[PDB]
Amino acid sequence: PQITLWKRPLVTIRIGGQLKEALLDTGADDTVIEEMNLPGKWKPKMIGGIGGFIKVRQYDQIPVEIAGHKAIGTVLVGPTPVNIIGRNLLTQIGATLNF
Amino acid sequence: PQITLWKRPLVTIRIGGQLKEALLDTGADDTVIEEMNLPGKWKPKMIGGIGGFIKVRQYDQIPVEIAGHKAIGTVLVGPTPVNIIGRNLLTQIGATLNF
Numbered sequence A, B: 001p002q003i004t005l006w007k008r009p010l011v012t013i014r015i016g017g018q019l020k021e022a023l024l025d026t027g028a029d030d031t032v033i034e035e036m037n038l039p040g041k042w043k044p045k046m047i048g049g050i051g052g053f054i055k056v057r058q059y060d061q062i063p064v065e066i067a068g069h070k071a072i073g074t075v076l077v078g079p080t081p082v083n084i085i086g087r088n089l090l091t092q093i094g095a096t097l098n099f
């Protein structure tokens, strides 16, 4: 799909067998999902953007379906204002910026 | 041009007569530029990132050139680690997300 930026680039994803809305964020190195229960082990981590640092749970090798496209990677779960799909998963589905 | 996401999408921009490196952020509603002495009238504003909010100064109708592409719009100046080009300016240069 070719997505324009007149509106926030939000898409439906499926993670942990659950449907959610996430933002395709080219300015994010990583993927940060709102607090939820994900199968498997996790290691505590700390990330920081504008506004400050937050504590997150790091889940590895998690399957995520973005708009029908499969990806399997690291997902950070924490107190984020929005679900963010970062470059680690965007590269897996072959997403690019064009102008 | 087509930009892959293996690395952060950093490009050269021109603002206030100066050249800077900025991140193309599809997850940013606004454009946030690092602290600089831009002339003109402004208004206080608070924007939120992943870890909280920061105080910024809002400047309107600021001419910004992105990768040789002219644009003009609102720029928020504040204490940011990186210059961020948001959707308000990306739409003007016809940027899209494709996968």
Ligand SMILES: CC[C@H](C)[C@@H]1NC(=O)[C@@H](NC[C@@H](O)[C@H](Cc2ccc(O)cc2)NC(=O)[C@H](C(C)C)N2CCCC2=O)Cc2ccc(cc2)OCCCNC1=O
Pocket (backbone or CB within 6 Å): A023, A025, A027, A028, A029, A030, A031, A032, A047, A048, A049, A050, A081, A082, A084, A086, B025, B027, B028, B029, B030, B032, B047, B048, B049, B050, B081, B082, B084
């Ligand atoms: C500041 C940019 C704009 C203003 C902001 N958008 C972003 O920050 C969006 N993009 C995040 C991106 O700007 C930001 C840029 C950046 C890069 C390196 C740094 O050292 C510091 C900041 N990236 C990150 O915060 C990501 C994080 C999401 C994993 N980080 C942290 C360090 C490395 C990295 O990539 C994400 C978001 C979207 C909506 C949000 C909050 C956050 O709430 C709704 C409110 C609207 N907020 C926004 O539109």
